[PDB]
Amino acid sequence: AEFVPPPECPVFEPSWEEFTDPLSFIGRIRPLAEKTGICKIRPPKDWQPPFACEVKSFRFTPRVQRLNELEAMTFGFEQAVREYTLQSFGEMADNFKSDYFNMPVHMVPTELVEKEFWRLVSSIEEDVIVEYGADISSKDFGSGFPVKDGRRKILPEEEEYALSGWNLNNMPVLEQSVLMKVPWLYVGMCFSSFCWHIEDHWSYSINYLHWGEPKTWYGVPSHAAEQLEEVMRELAPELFESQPDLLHQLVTIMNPNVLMEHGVPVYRTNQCAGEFVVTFPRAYHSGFNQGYNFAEAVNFCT
Ligand SMILES: CC(C)c1cc(C(=O)N2CC[C@H](NC(=O)C3CC3)C2)n[nH]1
Ligand SMILES: [Mn+2]
């Protein structure tokens, strides 16, 4: 049958008073959000940070992703990597989506891309290939947020965003222990996806979509982490079942309905431009991009 969308994860629209400190706000919403694994945070309408990346010199080499690579298990010269700019990648991304759905990219419903994505993942008749830039360090290209540094120029109206606590460059990243950490950038297109994973050291993670088409998320609360791992190991290929989790997490693709049928609670959301997504400790999550977009993420500690 067709894909059944999971229930929506919590969406918070804090006022200017509640939006003062991120760590205190996440701590207040924890009793609900930790029961869903992921949550979406919409900043106030007037909170609009400018895009501070060097678009003129942004040249990256995206990865190549075959959607049905695991289903094909039942030659490593499929496609080279190539190099794009932010504009040339966007032209390729919009052309791919408009030609695939035979309609303008802004007219494709999010539910349709969602149902088609999971059909292509398990399809052996069609081989769809997409590209995406991932784990791009914001120290080589600059962060999407304004940052006080000698390289970039900060307008007076942009200094508040360079000093804001919701600026991902200002999140605490040093974990406490007895006796370098920079946000990463993500340039996506239609069907470009990330498989089920948790963060290193079970850390928190916060994600911001600077611009572009939405990013679809799926989340599992931490109390069902061991249940997801049991379902994953029972249905993964025998060659990948005994692999360590940090290696298995590279190919942990699974339809959310399969997890839901085994009793694993799964929540979804469409992260739109200007919205935050927070994943809680040991909350497995996965998803895909609806189209050409630009995201930034960092793991933080409380
Ligand atoms: C900070 C870093 C270690 C990180 C990123 C994520 C993550 O979960 N995401 C999901 C959305 C974005 N990845 C994509 O958009 C790829 C192209 C499909 C980053 N977790 N830790
Ligand atoms: Mn993550």
Q: What is the CATH number of the domain that holds 263?
A: 2.60.120.650
- Specify the residue with its C-alpha closest to ligand 1, atom 9: 297
- Check pocket membership of 133 for ligand 1, CB cut-off 6 A: no
- Check pocket membership of 134 for ligand 1, CB cut-off 6 A: yes
Using DSSP, state whether 72 is helix, strand or coil: helix
Q: Which helix (H) or strand (E) holds 208?
A: strand 204-212
- Check pocket membership of 207 for ligand 1, CB cut-off 6 A: yes
Give the whole-angstrom CA distance, residue 47 versus residue 109.
27
- 20 Cα–ligand 1 center, Å: 25
Give the whole-angstrom CA distance, residue 54 versus residue 70.
37
CA–chain centroid gap for 123, Å, is: 23
- 3-class SS string, 113-142: HHHHHHHHHCCCCCCCEEEEEEEEEHHHHC
Phi, psi of 12 (to 5 degrees): -110, 135
Domain that holds residue 96: 1-302
CA–chain centroid gap for 292, Å, is: 13
Mutate to test the pocket of ligand 1, among 113, 205, 270 (most ligand atoms within 8 A of CB): 205
> Computed over its alpha carbons, how large is the radius of gyration of the chain?
19
Resolution (A): 1.7
CA–chain centroid gap for 153, Å, is: 28
Give the whole-angstrom CA distance, residue 63 versus residue 216.
19
Taking a C-beta distance cutoff of 8 angstroms, is the pair 185, 293 a contact?
A: no
Taking a C-beta distance cutoff of 8 angstroms, is the pair 205, 302 a contact?
A: no
- Check pocket membership of 65 for ligand 1, CB cut-off 6 A: no
Give the whole-angstrom CA distance, residue 144 versus residue 210.
7
Q: What is the tally of structural domains in the chain? A: 1
- Check pocket membership of 297 for ligand 1, CB cut-off 6 A: yes
Counting from 1 in the atom list of ligand 1, the atom nearest the Cα of 135 is 2
| End-to-end C-alpha distance for the chain, whole angstroms | 42
